[PDB]
Design a protein around this motif. Sequence first.
Motif, mmCIF file in Angstrom:
data_model
loop_
_atom_site.group_PDB
_atom_site.id
_atom_site.type_symbol
_atom_site.label_atom_id
_atom_site.label_comp_id
_atom_site.label_asym_id
_atom_site.label_seq_id
_atom_site.Cartn_x
_atom_site.Cartn_y
_atom_site.Cartn_z
ATOM 1 N N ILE A 192 -13.866 36.207 49.736
ATOM 2 C CA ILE A 192 -14.013 36.652 48.424
ATOM 3 C C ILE A 192 -12.589 37.171 47.847
ATOM 4 O O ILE A 192 -12.280 37.010 46.876
ATOM 5 N N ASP A 193 -11.702 37.668 49.021
ATOM 6 C CA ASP A 193 -10.417 38.375 48.667
ATOM 7 C C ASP A 193 -9.519 37.259 48.908
ATOM 8 O O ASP A 193 -8.196 37.244 48.214
ATOM 9 N N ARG A 194 -9.717 36.541 49.891
ATOM 10 C CA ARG A 194 -8.774 35.394 50.228
ATOM 11 C C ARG A 194 -8.930 34.101 49.273
ATOM 12 O O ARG A 194 -8.029 33.564 49.224
ATOM 13 N N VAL A 195 -10.169 34.039 48.991
ATOM 14 C CA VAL A 195 -10.497 32.672 48.032
ATOM 15 C C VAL A 195 -9.618 33.052 46.598
ATOM 16 O O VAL A 195 -9.079 31.970 46.088
ATOM 17 N N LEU A 196 -9.553 34.223 46.158
ATOM 18 C CA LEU A 196 -8.838 34.634 45.044
ATOM 19 C C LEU A 196 -7.212 34.105 45.099
ATOM 20 O O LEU A 196 -6.608 33.943 44.181
ATOM 21 N N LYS A 197 -6.762 34.036 46.475
ATOM 22 C CA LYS A 197 -5.434 33.544 46.702
ATOM 23 C C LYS A 197 -5.155 32.145 46.762
ATOM 24 O O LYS A 197 -3.841 31.912 46.861
ATOM 25 N N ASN A 198 -6.307 31.471 47.107
ATOM 26 C CA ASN A 198 -6.235 29.948 47.296
ATOM 27 C C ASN A 198 -5.571 29.158 46.236
ATOM 28 O O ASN A 198 -5.976 29.368 44.774
ATOM 29 N N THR A 199 -4.451 28.567 46.005
ATOM 30 C CA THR A 199 -3.807 28.000 44.820
ATOM 31 C C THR A 199 -4.824 27.030 44.091
ATOM 32 O O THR A 199 -4.588 27.199 42.725
ATOM 33 N N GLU A 200 -5.738 26.494 44.756
ATOM 34 C CA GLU A 200 -6.557 25.608 43.630
ATOM 35 C C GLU A 200 -7.441 26.544 42.766
ATOM 36 O O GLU A 200 -7.690 26.372 41.748
ATOM 37 N N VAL A 201 -8.016 27.675 43.393
ATOM 38 C CA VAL A 201 -8.951 28.597 42.674
ATOM 39 C C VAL A 201 -7.878 29.310 41.557
ATOM 40 O O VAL A 201 -8.349 29.400 40.488
ATOM 41 N N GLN A 202 -6.618 29.635 42.032
ATOM 42 C CA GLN A 202 -5.675 30.346 41.000
ATOM 43 C C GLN A 202 -5.641 29.362 39.991
ATOM 44 O O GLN A 202 -5.516 29.580 38.741
ATOM 45 N N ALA A 203 -5.501 27.995 40.184
ATOM 46 C CA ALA A 203 -4.818 26.950 39.097
ATOM 47 C C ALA A 203 -6.251 27.047 38.131
ATOM 48 O O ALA A 203 -6.147 27.164 36.878
ATOM 49 N N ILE A 204 -7.458 26.915 38.649
ATOM 50 C CA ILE A 204 -8.767 26.972 37.729
ATOM 51 C C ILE A 204 -8.936 28.364 36.970
ATOM 52 O O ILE A 204 -8.833 28.445 35.840
ATOM 53 N N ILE A 205 -8.637 29.332 37.600
ATOM 54 C CA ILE A 205 -8.626 30.737 36.809
ATOM 55 C C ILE A 205 -7.501 30.761 35.865
ATOM 56 O O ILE A 205 -7.936 31.155 34.497
ATOM 57 N N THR A 206 -6.249 30.292 36.128
ATOM 58 C CA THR A 206 -5.353 30.394 35.119
ATOM 59 C C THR A 206 -5.585 29.572 33.970
ATOM 60 O O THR A 206 -5.197 29.910 32.842
ATOM 61 N N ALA A 207 -5.933 28.166 34.355
ATOM 62 C CA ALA A 207 -6.293 27.455 33.456
ATOM 63 C C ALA A 207 -7.355 28.000 32.451
ATOM 64 O O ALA A 207 -7.245 27.601 30.955
ATOM 65 N N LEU A 208 -8.548 28.814 32.778
ATOM 66 C CA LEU A 208 -9.055 29.389 31.773
ATOM 67 C C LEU A 208 -8.597 30.083 30.876
ATOM 68 O O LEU A 208 -9.135 30.325 29.771
ATOM 69 N N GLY A 209 -7.683 30.833 31.295
ATOM 70 C CA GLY A 209 -6.778 31.548 30.462
ATOM 71 C C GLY A 209 -7.303 33.128 30.000
ATOM 72 O O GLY A 209 -6.641 34.044 29.381
ATOM 73 N N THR A 210 -8.311 33.400 30.483
ATOM 74 C CA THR A 210 -9.190 34.712 30.205
ATOM 75 C C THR A 210 -8.641 36.169 31.096
ATOM 76 O O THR A 210 -8.696 37.079 30.439
ATOM 77 N N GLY A 211 -8.276 35.942 32.199
ATOM 78 C CA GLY A 211 -7.884 36.803 32.959
ATOM 79 C C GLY A 211 -9.163 37.200 33.678
ATOM 80 O O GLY A 211 -10.176 36.494 33.465
ATOM 81 N N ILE A 212 -9.177 38.309 34.527
ATOM 82 C CA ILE A 212 -10.087 38.611 35.448
ATOM 83 C C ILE A 212 -10.474 39.934 35.543
ATOM 84 O O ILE A 212 -9.992 40.874 35.174
ATOM 85 N N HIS A 213 -11.946 40.094 35.846
ATOM 86 C CA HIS A 213 -12.334 41.586 35.983
ATOM 87 C C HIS A 213 -12.258 42.457 34.569
ATOM 88 O O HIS A 213 -12.509 42.119 33.544
ATOM 89 N N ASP A 214 -11.322 43.343 34.683
ATOM 90 C CA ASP A 214 -11.075 44.289 33.782
ATOM 91 C C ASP A 214 -10.170 43.604 32.768
ATOM 92 O O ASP A 214 -10.372 43.882 31.513
ATOM 93 N N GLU A 215 -9.211 42.762 33.263
ATOM 94 C CA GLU A 215 -8.335 42.182 32.106
ATOM 95 C C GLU A 215 -9.020 40.970 31.351
ATOM 96 O O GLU A 215 -8.447 40.537 30.465
#
Length: 185
Positions: A24-47
Amino acid sequence: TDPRKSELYVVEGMFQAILPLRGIDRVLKNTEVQAIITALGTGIHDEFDIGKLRYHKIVLMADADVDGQHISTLLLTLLFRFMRPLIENGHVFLAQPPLYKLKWQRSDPEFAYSDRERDGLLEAGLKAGKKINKEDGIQRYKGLGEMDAKELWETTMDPSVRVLRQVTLDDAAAADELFSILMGE
């Protein structure tokens, strides 16, 4: 390709972006997951800012087996925990890949998304005069990797034919519980 006209496909490893996710914490650091999160453009949690969403639709595509369920499970929980409005607002979908390919002898092949559709298409074709090999005319797909690139697009990405299922808040909550149980080992 502006957001409204854009879709992001996340596939097991109208502008249509495509990113892979190898299963859950390491998953967020996986580059494939990061690319997806970044591509969405919304930011995470509070942001998290819905106004910055880059894609009108987010489509998860994976094999119907355990390995496929796992990534779809992991992805749905990340969204439910850190980007929930994407789900509540109805941006998340699951793509249903076809189950069978009907190899008509002298016509275009047809694809079936369920056993019932397979039977109907078969009967309909036979009655129309279409010919099919009784021993190998019907291919049962084992996974997405068994598909031809062009056929994968025509059956799961082509907007006028693809079969999409909207992920509800309840669905995502179910995936999150599943993720929890399985992590509990």
